[PDB]
Design a protein around this ligand. Structure first.
Ligand SMILES: CC(C)(O)c1ncc(-c2ccc3nc4n(c3c2)[C@@H](c2ccccc2)CCC4)cn1
Lengths: 131, 146, 137
């Protein structure tokens, strides 16, 4: 009966990382692309995004992935990669334990959805589990 | 500190001090950082209060501006020191060779381990001069009892 | 004690030229039914699992395609189905860590393999660099 969620990216979304319900249980909601915490407590929060490109363009490519908390906006977990015509592939994966409050909204965002590996949307995920 | 939560599961999430000169110094006295249900932070190490299975994780982020003439090797290692054994042991480790455009190299390490009461866990790097602290949430170390 | 099937196995640092997973090593584990048989993790019960693996390749200069693949062999289709795969072209010492991870629905008796194409390029200098594990969600 512990609040839990595991949401996955929509492969059909254009220019965005749209989360889809995968599961939501025991009060967790997915609203406006954010996971909504039903009760105060410790939660493991995790995510993985996958990027891919064909070669390197004229502008420097920096890929970011950040999990933030908005209490009723602060970065909890974040990382950046610089991958740069040969194909390249890079994952960014994050996780940690945090004390959350009722009604907190969690977001898992990237700066370059144009580089998402949409074909592997099943493994572009974001989830929480109450501990 | 002695914080408690209803599940009584030992947990910790500590973060780097960005102004620590030439080192990776962990802190629990920060917003969105914590020690609960018996975990202690002593001499820069997490101290396990009870035996059991634990998830152990850490992330560091390195950044440089271009590539220098000397070879850059970046390492991040999580180690365990047991009381009965008194021997250091690497649990998780990675090495990266990133090489003027900025480069970024995160290192995330995570796994599941059987730990013993009184074990001390360390999370260390070889190049604190390449650590990046431009945003919160980039450098951290934690444990979660299952 | 936790009842969730879990495993974290590590490469045998002295088995140079091979990728042999070990569960008896210090800081390697099998719990709650997971087995290590014929170099594969055996799933004890159906459910959602995180599967992960890190390998680390190293070379001294450039003479190379490096692959890392996690596959599933089901009792109902006893052939490798690739679940996660990566390929790198690394070409002074170079290092190439490869991480694979994902959440999958597994069945009782599934065998999971984590394999590379070039064990001659694996780095076995330090402990904790090469591992393969599962965690029942
Ligand atoms: C507590 C419970 C219910 O047993 C449970 N354990 C683990 C997960 C889980 C699932 C998917 C994940 N993807 C990642 N992680 C995931 C954790 C993080 C990570 C991996 C391995 C070690 C430590 C951290 C961070 C990297 C990406 C979910 N639920």
């Amino acid at each position: 009966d512990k609040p839990v969620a595991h949401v996955v990216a929509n492969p059909q979304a254009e220019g965005q990382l749209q989360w889809l319900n995968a599961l939501l249980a025991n009060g967790v909601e997915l609203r406006d692309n954010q996971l909504v915490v039903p009760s105060e407590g410790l939660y493991l929060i995790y995510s993985q995004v996958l990027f891919k490109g064909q070669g390197c363009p004229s502008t420097h490519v920096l890929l970011t992935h950040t999990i933030s908390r908005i209490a009723v906006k602060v970065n909890l977990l974040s990382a950046i990669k610089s991958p740069c015509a040969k194909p390249w592939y890079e994952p960014i994966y994050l996780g940690g334990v945090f004390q959350l409050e009722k009604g907190d909204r969690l977001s898992a965002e990237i700066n370059r959805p144009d580089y998402l590996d949409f074909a592997e949307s099943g493994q572009v995920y974001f989830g929480i589990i109450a501990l």
